[PDB]
């Protein structure tokens, strides 16, 4: 239960499968999750993309926040793992 | 539930609350959660101050791309909230 997306997830179906009458509380308390890790990974796009755009346009003042944008990419790809072209997500060097 | 980052929250401690024994388990699912809406509130702060760079120099070819991260954090605001200027995470 190392602090992954998947031990949250994990810890979830678990209670449910205990305790049958959790199903529908925790099951959208998974959703609300799901949805906050779409939303986080949509603006993470966009941030990049824009990023992208700083660089491309050789504009250097803005480059340290070019590479803050870059460590908290990686550092979300530690937690939540990154979601592959065949639209599972996997981790680690799963992803490579 | 209104799918809200609260709404989820209480569910995992109410279930807790029925069975003890679920709760070093969804203790740390909340954690993770918690540590997610961090992480992510981090990125979008830093990516609304390089819409902002973007747009005190008046470049508007990346115009579209700045008013993309309006419309999300907007978004996120009505999923998880805000948190006020007393440290309150509050919902509209
Ligand atoms: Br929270
Ligand atoms: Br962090
Ligand atoms: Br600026
Ligand atoms: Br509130």
Same mark, same amino acid.
């Given at each position: 239960?190392?602090?992954?997306?998947?031990?949250? %997830?994990?810890?979830?179906?678990?209670?449910?499968?205990?305790?049958?009458?959790?199903?529908?509380? #925790?099951?959208?308390?998974?959703?609300?999750?799901?949805?906050?890790?779409?939303?986080?990974?949509? #603006?993470?796009?966009?941030?990049?993309?824009?990023?992208?755009?700083?660089?491309? %346009?050789?504009?250097?003042?803005?480059?340290?926040?070019?590479?803050?944008?870059?460590?908290?990419?990686?550092?979300?790809?530690?937690?939540?793992?990154?979601?592959? %072209?065949?639209?599972?997500?996997?981790?680690?060097?799963?992803?490579?």
């Amino acid at each position: 239960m190392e602090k992954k997306l998947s031990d949250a %997830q994990v810890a979830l179906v678990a209670a449910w499968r205990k305790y049958p009458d959790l199903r529908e509380s #925790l099951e959208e308390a998974a959703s609300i999750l799901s949805l906050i890790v779409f939303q986080a990974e949509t #603006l993470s796009d966009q941030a990049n993309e824009l990023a992208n755009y700083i660089r491309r %346009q050789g504009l250097e003042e803005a480059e340290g926040a070019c590479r803050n944008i870059d460590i908290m990419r990686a550092k979300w790809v530690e937690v939540c793992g990154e979601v592959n %072209q065949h639209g599972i997500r996997v981790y680690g060097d799963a992803i490579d």
